[model samples]
Target: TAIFSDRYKGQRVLGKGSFGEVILCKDKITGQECAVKVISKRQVKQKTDKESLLREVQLLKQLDHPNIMKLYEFFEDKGYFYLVGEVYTGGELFDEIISRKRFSEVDAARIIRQVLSGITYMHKNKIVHRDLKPENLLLESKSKDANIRIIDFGLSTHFEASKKMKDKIGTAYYIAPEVLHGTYDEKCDVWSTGVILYILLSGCPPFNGANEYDILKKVEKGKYTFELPQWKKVSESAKDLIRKMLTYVPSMRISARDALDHEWIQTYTKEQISVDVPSLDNAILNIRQFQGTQKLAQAALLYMGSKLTSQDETKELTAIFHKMDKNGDGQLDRAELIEGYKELMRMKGQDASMLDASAVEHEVDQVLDAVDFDKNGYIEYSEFVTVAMDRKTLLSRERLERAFRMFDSDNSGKISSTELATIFGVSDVDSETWKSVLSEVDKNNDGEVDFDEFQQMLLKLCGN
Candidate 1:
């Protein structure tokens, strides 16, 4: 019942907004520090609170990428809804750029490249970040090499080509002209991305005026320039890409994929810096080694994977995941997994003669069967991480207790059949069915599963 207070220790306030305060908290079990946005229930009114909170949660859970901010987990109490997420120290891109005044072409390109990778992944999954701006782009840490993580999905939504998006939603300077007209598509994001790049290079937005209305009028007319000191040093190709991204016609606007492949992005980012190749090889090996099959362990792993694992901890695996997504569609299918496995083996200098196609295919099938918990044809990012992470570190007793508490909804120090049914998403978890489900883990014959039983089950199931 006191789950939020029991699990997280709120250390300090990060930010104070309209309805809530963002607190930096440490998960009592895993000792993982994160930010928790605690919104007062009474402030939002029921409908909008549920509407915005559910929509954001639904969208964030589906997203998995190095550059996107992850929603670890959430909790609710009588007065507030607490949203737990990755905490960043480097501040917003807006503040960072403002402090620097402007950035060199290479520096600007570096930021844009990362943003494009994330946007490309989002678009691949049919989600549009209707409001893309510097304020929403967060730097992971204070270090120079720290990565950018995209945040704020309050205005984001999934789209289909059949239906055109019609929302006059977004910040003035960054809002795509088509969006202001109340009709647009995914290209609107590309337009906003262009504005970010422009501001980075020039220390000023392309569309700016005395007021919001004045700035939006400029945006609608598409009047801007790359003049003076800023334009003098920037490359012709970079300007060309900006033109493509900020094109007046939504249909003609460059796609996130095309923007990523642009010469400006490719040339400046030629170093192709990523996680070590050997580390990536080990990540692939970890994926192959995953063998836990217990239903509770699987569910518990999802909790740890989404909540406990930090961006720093899964750096290598994240890189490997992106590499494995050959088609750049943000998911791994049967063929892609098989191909990735074979590629890793080749990287390890394994004998080509032993690499029979069908045998490798069979191995991939087994891996997929274990990793794809939802039985979907493709392996999502979170699903892959749930299995690929080092289980020894993942299955700690403290973390196990935290997971158990989540299942033990009543906080009775034990998990009932009804609780199991909720976590498992089963409509009818009858006594007989629960007995069968708990046959291995319910060691005390008490009908309900206690903390010790749950811990032992996961530890043994995850292997020593």
Candidate 2:
């Protein structure tokens, strides 16, 4: 059951890939059931294959979208590559939908909405799935209300605003016409979701042929009809959405958010009950852009990726900010700032008397000035991150050495009130106040503070 697989108790082969296979695994430490995709190193002999592998690892390490499968960890050995990820008992989306026998308009809306929600997150983050299809969608269970998990990121990539990629990637049937023509962007994912919606509603691919060439040819023609017998009973709103999604021109494709707000989705989700036919077009209900089911997925993903900075310190500070931000907008108003300061003081076990409400208010202003780089008054999350992660940027030893050498005057390796007073430059009249501070560092009542005492004094003042 295990070889170099010392970590997990590997079970049966879940699915086979070109260079590897997915195996069911129970993690040794977490004891949670997971899937381990095992790949043979010999198969990745080509430069492109190796590059593709690194891209997948990098993408997974950055993204923590909830619907996307979580990559727990990856390890390598001499001949094999091991990636431990999520496990789904319900199997692929196509198989689960096929088993239902009757994929209702409501069912279609639920599944598509989830897929689009994830798509929205990816696009918002300036990344593209590139490969979104039924087979890549996973069901948490066989239930009609199962969670949809987007899996397999071998072709996903990030881009800048207005950036276009010319690579021909993605599944043959789900590929957009523009993608094959020359170049495309994130909108290509919208086209793939449209094809998935079409399949879900009528149990037939919108474009099909004897081979890939014919299928692509049909896609380019952009002439799919809803004449499948099952579609006759489907709602007009659903049909309208499908048309918008499967638009021949990629530029005109329905965005994930817009699709959710379409009449079909709104009318269907608002009613909560399902039937063969949808409401009339002219008077169709205008509902929310995202239903609760759809919203749950989006909210969950955002909650997990709230930091989005890939730093533990940022995440820790973000968690605190969210607690004070009742609206969760990442901006702390005056009252919220007060709340944050109070919370921090409590955590440090300080007496409230140290900073009364008025004092805390002034202190908040000072803290914001130091990190508010934006100067927006309302403390934003990024500003909060700067303050939290500022420690990482202070590792320049040159500055520390320069300051130490300046204060250690006369080359005696010791400092007196005269040398330290030159550094402090306080309004102490005759170095009396500065002398008090220096004496505290002079342990054992030594009149002259040694370098060790000087270093300890500086570290204490720095709050490190």
Question: Mind sharing the TM-score for model 2?
Answer: 0.52
lDDT of 1: 0.62
Query: For each candidate, C-alpha RMSD in Å?
Result: 24.3, 28.8
lDDT of 1 by residue, 1-464 (tens): 55676777766667542235577888879999988776654444443445665666776776788888888877776655677789989987644543442245666678899999998998887777777876578899887677999875433442111110011112577889998788988889899999878766655668865434667789999979877454665678878999999899989888999899998888777755322211222222221221111123334544333333333345644566687676687776666655655654444322221124554575555555666364447766546554543431444445456646644435688775555544332211133543554676554565566777655543443332
Q: What TM-score goes with each of the models?
A: 0.51, 0.52
Candidate 2 residue-wise lDDT at 399: 34
- Top candidate when judged by lDDT against the true structure: 1
Model 1 clashing residue pairs (backbone): none
Error of 1 at 37 (Å): 2.2
lDDT of 2 by residue, 280-322 (tens): 2211111111111122222222222222222444455567778
Q: Which lDDT values do the candidates have, in the order given?
A: 0.62, 0.58
Off by over 4 Å in 1: 1-3, 17-20, 40-59, 76-80, 97-102, 154-170, 272-464
